[PDB]
Nucleic acid binder design. Structure first.
Length: 497
DNA sequence: TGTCCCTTCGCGTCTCT
DNA sequence: AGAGACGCGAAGGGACA
């Protein structure tokens, strides 16, 4: 390993080799993930207690052991999981998955030990739910956030008017301690001195690095409104993503350069700046906006639409590289390439449309225009890669037409909807009498997976809001508004009927 | 060279309808 | 149905032992 000892790197490669054996049966990716973030002592820990973790009263899966191990301090997390999982599960209600989610962060040990110590008082003195305490705990520095919720949730509720839900939302990010103390320190000035509402201070504080975003809003909002012409509402939208501090500083530096030298509106720079990596997006359009309207290329409108998503930098740089070979050796129009790239993870969708247009048409019989409709949604790579795995079993075994698989894959969260259809098509049809036509219709929207799960939960275990919504009304509800429609129906019955 | 905490970037999914 | 919201992993940086 590192320079200190020697050539018993062999002892470590042997330890890594035995983890490929049983009871964990780890592959290369998994060993690589552990060594890149938990280090050698995490690898050594997994190996030392791979039997204890896999049996005894923990019964962890290898993916579960790999999630706990693959963080700074992983060996402490694995040690502590073995000591605390049972009492957290049995004495406090939490599931194993929830204990693993608390454990799967840097400092995992501290978080688990603190939930043990603080979950009761947080629930009893402050009225939080187990669920909320897990969400506070499940981030790096979760010990600190938990202790800070316990000290400040009273003052933030009383003196500053927030709800617990709100405090929990500021608390449920890495550096949630920092965000929560900054909210206490700056909330009144941000409202009183810059005309913000508590809700906006909250939205700015509710992401990681929220401390930084709030200090930066205090600092640059004046210069950005009073000297660059922006509104308070616009500044807040820039500030309301993690990295907001970077997005605001970059707006200030590039706003006049982009509005004079390249001809964009302020309102368009605001839209590029208002995503995660806004700083990265802005710089990358400031390069690249000359060359992307060259050879003809694209409009400005289309550069802004591609940049206006998380990872905007990545989509532009990828679009700029692959628009030539996509238009020329696969037959796509730029209007199609920009449509692939104008979602979250546009980069990922383009690279998968690269090496799957050929393959999806050949080994599965799809047209190009189908492969484009799949990849023209957020999570393109996931939908395409999962159409490739699951089309065979969905048509042949479960009876579906390919055009039906493609209707389900052609929405954000496609892979979730497909993997749910497969899991839940049998129990929906044969045990509850829904047609495949109806299941496909619920699956064919945003929120296909939750809509299918909620419908099966309502049917399998007749929930409280009962009877009058027959099986066809529930399907009409699941189609119209997904899980939200289904839950609103439940919630409205509970007090009215 | 490990353990803890904090910040930023990017990817994926769901809600709002 | 397009924008705006939710979640969460990877990675990098600083403090301290």
């Amino acid at each position: 390993m590192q320079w200190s000892g020697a050539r018993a790197l062999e002892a470590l490669l042997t330890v890594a080799g035995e983890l490929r054996g049983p009871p964990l049966q780890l592959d290369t990716g998994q060993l690589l993930k552990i060594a890149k973030r938990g280090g050698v002592t995490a690898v050594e820990a997994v190996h030392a207690w791979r039997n204890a973790l896999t049996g005894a009263p923990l019964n962890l899966t290898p993916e579960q052991v790999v999630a706990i191990a693959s963080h700074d301090g992983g060996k402490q997390a694995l040690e502590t999981v073995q000591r605390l999982l049972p009492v957290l599960c049995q004495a406090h209600g939490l599931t194993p998955q929830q204990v693993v989610a608390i454990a799967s962060h840097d400092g995992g040990k501290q978080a688990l030990e603190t939930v043990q110590r603080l979950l009761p008082v947080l629930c009893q003195a402050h009225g939080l739910t187990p669920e909320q305490v897990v969400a506070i705990a499940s981030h790096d520095g979760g010990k600190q956030a938990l202790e800070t919720v316990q000290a400040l949730l009273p003052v933030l509720c009383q003196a500053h008017g927030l709800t617990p839900e709100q405090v929990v939302a500021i608390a449920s990010n890495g550096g949630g301690k920092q965000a929560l103390e900054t909210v206490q320190r700056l909330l009144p000035v941000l409202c009183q001195a810059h005309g913000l509402t508590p809700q906006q201070v909250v939205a700015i504080a509710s992401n990681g690095g929220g401390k930084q975003a709030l200090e930066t809003v205090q600092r640059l909002l004046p210069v950005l409104c009073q000297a660059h012409g922006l509104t308070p509402q616009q500044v807040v939208a820039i500030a309301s993503h993690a990295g907001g501090k970077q997005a605001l500083e970059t707006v200030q530096r590039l706003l006049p350069v982009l509005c004079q030298a390249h001809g964009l509106t302020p309102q368009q720079v605001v839209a590029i700046a208002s995503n995660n990596g806004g700083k990265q997006a802005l710089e990358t359009v400031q390069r690249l906006l000359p060359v992307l309207c060259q050879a003809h290329g694209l409009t400005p409108q289309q550069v802004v639409a591609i940049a206006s998503h998380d990872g905007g930098k990545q989509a532009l740089e990828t679009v700029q590289r692959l628009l030539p070979v996509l238009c020329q050796a696969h037959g796509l129009t730029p209007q199609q390439v920009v449509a692939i790239a104008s979602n979250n993870g546009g980069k990922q969708a383009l690279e998968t449309v690269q090496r799957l247009l050929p393959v999806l048409c050949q080994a599965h019989g799809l047209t190009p225009e189908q492969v484009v409709a799949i990849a023209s949604n957020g999570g393109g790579k996931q939908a395409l890669e999962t159409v490739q795995r699951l089309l065979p079993v969905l048509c042949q075994a479960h009876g579906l037409t390919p055009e039906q698989v493609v209707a389900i894959a052609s929405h954000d969260g496609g892979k979730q909807a497909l993997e749910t259809v497969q899991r839940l098509l049998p129990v929906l049809c044969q045990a509850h009498g829904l047609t495949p036509q109806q299941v496909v219709a619920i699956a064919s929207n945003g929120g296909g997976r939750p809509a299918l799960e909620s419908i099966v939960a309502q049917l399998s275990r007749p929930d409280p809001a009962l009877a009058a919504l027959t099986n066809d009304h529930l399907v009409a509800l699941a189609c119209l508004g997904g899980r939200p429609a289904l839950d609103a129906v439940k919630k409205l019955e509970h007090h009215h009927h």
